[PDB]
Structures are given as C-alpha cells and as structure tokens.
Design a protein around this nucleic acid. Sequence first.
DNA 1: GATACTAGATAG
DNA 2: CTATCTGAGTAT
Lengths: 393, 392
Amino acid sequence: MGSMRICIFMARGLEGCGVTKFSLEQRDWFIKNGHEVTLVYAKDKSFTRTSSHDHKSFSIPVILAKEYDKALKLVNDCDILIINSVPATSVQEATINNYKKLLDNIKPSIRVVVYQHDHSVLSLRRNLGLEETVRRADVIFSHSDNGDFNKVLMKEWYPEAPTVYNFQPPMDIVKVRSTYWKDVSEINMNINRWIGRTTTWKGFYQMFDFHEKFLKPAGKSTVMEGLERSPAFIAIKEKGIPYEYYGNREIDKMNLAPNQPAQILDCYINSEMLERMSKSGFGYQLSKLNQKYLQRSLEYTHLELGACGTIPVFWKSTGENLKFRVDNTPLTSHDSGIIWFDENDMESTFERIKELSSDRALYDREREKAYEFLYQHQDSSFCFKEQFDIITK
Amino acid sequence: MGSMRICIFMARGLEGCGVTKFSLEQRDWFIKNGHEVTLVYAKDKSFTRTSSHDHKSFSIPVILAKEYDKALKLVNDCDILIINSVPATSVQEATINNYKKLLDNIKPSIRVVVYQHDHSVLSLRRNLGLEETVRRADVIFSHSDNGDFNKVLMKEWYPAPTVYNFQPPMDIVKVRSTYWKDVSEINMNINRWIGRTTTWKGFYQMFDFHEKFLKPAGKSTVMEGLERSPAFIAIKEKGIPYEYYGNREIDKMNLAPNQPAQILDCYINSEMLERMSKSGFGYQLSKLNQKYLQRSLEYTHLELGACGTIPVFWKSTGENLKFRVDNTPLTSHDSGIIWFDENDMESTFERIKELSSDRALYDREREKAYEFLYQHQDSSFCFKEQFDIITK
DNA sequence: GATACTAGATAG
DNA sequence: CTATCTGAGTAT
Ligand SMILES: O=c1ccn([C@@H]2O[C@H](COP(=O)(O)OP(=O)(O)O)[C@@H](O)[C@H]2O)c(=O)[nH]1
Ligand SMILES: O=c1ccn([C@@H]2O[C@H](COP(=O)(O)OP(=O)(O)O)[C@@H](O)[C@H]2O)c(=O)[nH]1
Ligand SMILES: [Cl-]
C-alpha cells in the first residue's frame, strides 16, 4: 500500500494522559511510515495536564461549540479519521451537538477508526456521543475482550455486528532509550520513584505502605510523581500518612535524603520525568487493574520505566493477568527483570531490590532483559503495524 | 431546671436520618430553653445523607481513632452527656476501642443519658460498644417497653436498670410558620411519599396505589427518599415502572399526568417540606411491626402535618400507636389524617377525592392534622417530659 | 423458595 | 471526601 492522510481526532480534548500519549505515538508512527498526519483536538474543555507532553507545535485546537465549519473541514480531509476520545458529559449542548453533527457529515469514503481507551463502565458512562461514534465507525479497538466495552455497552447498542479488534498502546521504546538511557555508574540506587496519579487503582497507597515499612527504614528515598491535588488526600491526610508536596516549580526543593517521608510531585513533564527516572534506581508503577480489563495492554508509564534504564517494579497481579505479545504467555512467567511487587510478600520484593542495589553488574543484566522484554511486548514497531494492517485490511 | 452544658454525641457519625434529626431537634429545644449545647459526632464513618439536614455550621466532627484527646476534651466539657448512637460494626479497632476508653474516662460527675433509637435485634446488634454505654448510662430511653432492647438485650446484659420510654419530638410549630402555604397554591393532583428504601417504609404499597388509582385518575406521584441501595435491586427485578431523578435534575421531573411514579433519592429536608407544603397529599406508610410501636412517630410523619399538606399514614400503625394525652389508640380521633388501608385502597382514594375537591374542606382537615400532631409529639411537650426524667 | 429487611469501585 | 453507578446478601 501507499501513503495516506490520517486525521487523529481527540474530541474529548487534550487530557495529557494515556489518550494524549497514544495519539502522539500514533502520530509519530504514521509519520515515520510515510503518512501525512494532522492532529485535531476539541479545545472546548480544558485540562490540567495540558503541557505534560510536547505537542503545541502541531496539535490543532478546534472549538466544536463554534468552529463547527473549521472542524468539519479538518475531519473530512483525510483517508482515515482516527477518533480516540469523545466529548465529556460536562460540555455544553453546542459542543456535543456539533460533535454529533460532524459524525453525520463525514465523507462516506473516509474510513472512521474508533479506539475505545477506558476500561470500567464508570468511565465509559461519562462519554457523550460514543454511540454515534461507534455506529459510524468502520473499525473498533478496545483493551480487553472481556472489558465493560465489549461486554456491557457493545451488546447494549447492538442486541446480538460489528467486530471489536484488540490493541495495545504502543510507544517508540527504542527512541526513549536512545534519548534517556544512562550508565549504571550514574544511578542513585537509593531513589525509589513511583509515577501515576491520585487514583486509588494506580496504587499510591501501597507505595506509601512499602515506604514506611521497608524503604524508609533502610535509608532509601521515595519520590511519588503525578499525584494531582484532589479530595482523595482528605483520606490520605487524616488516614494517618506523612508526605511532602511539591509544585512542579519546587522540584528542586525535594528532600532526596534518608529518613524522609514520601516526597510528592503533583504533575510532570514526560521528558523531565524520564530524565529524573533514568537516574533512578527503581521505578514503581503499581496499577492493580481488574482482570476483566487486562489482556495485552500495559500502560504508558509501564513502558517508560523499562524504557529509560531503571528496574521496573510492577504489580504482581497485573503481570499475572497480562499475556505476552508473542507466545501469549503470562508476563510474570518470564525472566524479564521486572521486579514483581508482591503486595503480600513485600519483604520478598524488598530483598530483590537490595540484591541489585549492591551488584551493579546484575543490575544492568536485569534492566537489559527488562528493556528487551517490554520492547518485544509493546513497542511501536510491532503494535502499530499490527493495527494498521487491521484498519487497511 | 436552670442552665447546663449539653453534649449530644453521635458516635456512629452523622447518618442524616431520624437519629440525626432527633439530635438537631433536641439541640434546638435545649438552646431554646437556655442551655449551652455542642453537637459532637464521630467522623470515623461517613454516610450518604450527610446533607439532608443543615448542621455543617455548628456540628463538631471527631476522629475517634486518631483524635481521642480531642474527643475526651469534648464529652467531659458538659453537665449532661447525651449519646444517641454508637460506632458501627464496620469500623476499625482504633475506633470502637477509643470510643470505649472514652466511656471509661468520662468524669463520674457527668450525667450520661442514652437514647436507643433502634427496633429490631439486627439493628440492636449492628452496633458496637452499646453494652459498655448502656452500662455507663445514668438514664436510658427507647421507643417501646416491648422491644428487643428491653426484652432481648437488656435481659441479656441484666438477668437494674430502668428504661424509660420516649418519642422523637419535633418543633411542629416552627415548621408550620415557614412552609404552610395557602390552599391556593396546593396543587391537589400531586402525591408525594416520604421515607427510604426499606420494605417497612411502605414503598411497595405506594407503587401499587399509583397504579390502581393515582395513575388512572390522571394524578401524578413522586416518591422522595428512595436510595439506590441494594434494596433497590428488588424494585428493578420486580420490574416496576419508575423514573429516577437526582437533585441536580429535580426540575426535569415529568410532573404531567399519566406517568410512572417519579422517584427522587436522597433529598434535602428543607426542599422536601417545601414542595410538600405546595403539594396535594403527603404519604407515609411506615408499616412498622407493633412491638416496636408505642408512642413514637417518625419525623417524616410529623413533617407532613407540619407543612400543611394532607397526611396519609399507614392505617395498621395508628392503631398500635397510643396518643400522648389519654394514651388511647391514635386512629380513634378526628386526626384529620387518612388512614391508608392497603386492603381498601379505593376507600382511601375516596376520602382523597372527597377532600381534594372542596378546596375549603381540605384547608379545614389539615388544620386538624397540625393540632392533633402538635398535641402528640411537639418539642415543648416531649423534651420537657424528657428533661424532667433526666433531671429527676 | 416466600417474606422482610439490608457497599465496593471509581471518577473528579 | 462527594457524586454517579450498579445490581444481592442476610435471616428465619
Ligand atoms: O502528570 C503527569 C501524568 C502523566 N504523564 C504521562 O502521561 C502518560 C499516561 O499514560 P498511562 O496510560 O500510564 O496513564 P493514565 O493515562 O492511565 O493516567 C505517561 O506517559 C505519563 O508519563 C505526564 O507526563 N504527567
Ligand atoms: O433523604 C432523606 C431522608 C430523610 N430525611 C429526613 O430525615 C428524617 C427521617 O426521620 P424518620 O424517623 O421518619 O426516618 P428514619 O429515622 O427511620 O430514617 C425526616 O425528618 C426526613 O424528612 C431527609 O431529610 N432526607
Ligand atoms: Cl491508554
């Protein structure tokens, strides 16, 4: 096949999280493969993390609620329209109304591709127009065959077509490495860095646990990145938990020294973090996702850890519930390097951390296999090729 | 008596229901009679209806688990400590535990009054540390001499002491002078039911009614209070037609005739009484068993006749509930209330037309409602009755 | 069964 | 925490 013009549409806005990251990585790949790519997003709703990713140079903001004409032209200008998000249940009638409008005036030639990115129904039920989007769509992707998308909504709308293929949010792992990788001689093995967001399932509570019980009592330092301000702290606070908060402006005032509680950081720049991470001894990404929602998809923050040369420390459960991209075997059942964080036998998890904190050689060996495991499981070189073939089939 | 400091303590935390209403009504009566009051409540467990009543401006929350000092400072600062509830069984050790340490460190000079607002044994067991409290109480109330508390549990702990009876008093008078609209704004066709998602709050019976009569006759029905708690899976599974509006969408309530019953979950007490004082009729069929019934009505009951609407109470009930004055079955009076009979549901719909036609006969029946209820459970009569027992 | 009475997950 | 959502469990 030849070259096609792809329009990557984010109708929910640019949230600066997985959906933004995915859109971006998706952009870089079509481009890297000889394809014209525009990236449109609804500016109608504004988001906190609108600067975590570098995109202000090519993203094309539009305001459904007024610039309908502008939007209508953009979307109708391509061979493939990829929809990664839809308006949120908080936008004004105009916005949503005009978005439903766009779905009706797409040249029937164009090939609409919907990517459902959320898992739980609590999330899906916060969308507006998702049905008009799915109906008009020609190809549909989701994270799990057993997720609330394929199982709940999909059968709701269609009491009985169409085929919802599977996908994994790819990342050009090779590139992040050749940009942030470091020499083990430069990695403070004492810095334990967790990244995610103030959402119970990303597993920030457990990080706190693992610090007050093993990390801190060993002279180690813990930095928890990405916890936006939220009432969820109300809980954290008088739940009896010490920590120190830093605005992304106070990042240089963190106490990365011993016998110090959890150093927090509300929001961050992908790149800035990767850098910080690359010189970190152990990154922790502890999403404890429900098994109904897991299949082949690791989150971007899983990919970034192994990507920049730090020992990945993911949630044991998740590794058990995810199947490798090649042989389709469990993740936990591989010599990846991945220190599987054991919520129960934590002590055991801490032992493997100390075993590598002192053996620099072992380290490199563990992170090399980890880099390669993940690279093999969900790198953009494979995942987008697997998807593109589905779309163009 | 004179002037004393009162500390109304809600150990289970603010549940926003009757027990939460009782405390506020109690606080209002004490203050009104000039007694310094402070309303403490254990934050160790949050409940959804924490907005039903306004209290955010005075109530004082406490974390029994991490702020024990603060707690003990609060209960020992008063002459009479009133405990209306205890911690739940779902709480963590540090709570139930510190709650007890409290009970044991309460000055011996403070008079501890305990109000047991529960009925069944289930309920009388879904609480922790009750025994420690009852044992510490200088005074103990309950809703019925023939309940599970006096019979089952009391005899259990004490095979000494006395358990006086009481009623949950409300300022019927204060709620009139604010919501009691003019019979020229009372949309006779509206039928509002109050209570919550539990079989004995007669909600199943409502639906039936809006079906065998209300819906037919072109009327409309709204039932406020139905929370989508697990008890709701019963409504859905029994397949009943209803439309569910929250409080941000109370407006979009299709009020027009020929409609299913309009359900509204956890509502505001001030808003409810409002609409209810502009509504044709107020239903409340608390079909509570008799053993638990003795003289106590529910605030949902006393709030209907209070906002000048036509009170529809579950017949069975009024028959077991004795009148505060002569102690005679309620129902045998000219209460001005419709004794909703699940059996002769039509007869009930009759007295409803009979009174929803003559907009002059309606205004004269609700005037018997208010007075009869005022004489049975008003703050001035009851809290004076309770203050005496407490101070004896 | 009949009948009566009664919370874990997650997004913002 | 507060809000929207979903679909049994308990006891006799
Ligand atoms: O404050 C933040 C939060 C997240 N991210 C990045 O946004 C992506 C989020 O992807 P993932 O799917 O792991 O997170 P989720 O979208 O599920 O929140 C990752 O590249 C993060 O490093 C960021 O740059 N700053
Ligand atoms: O969603 C609700 C439910 C109830 N109530 C009020 O809470 C009290 C409940 O008293 P009652 O004893 O009738 O009910 P229960 O205590 O059994 O919940 C009454 O004043 C109701 O008006 C309220 O404000 N909002
Ligand atoms: Cl994603």
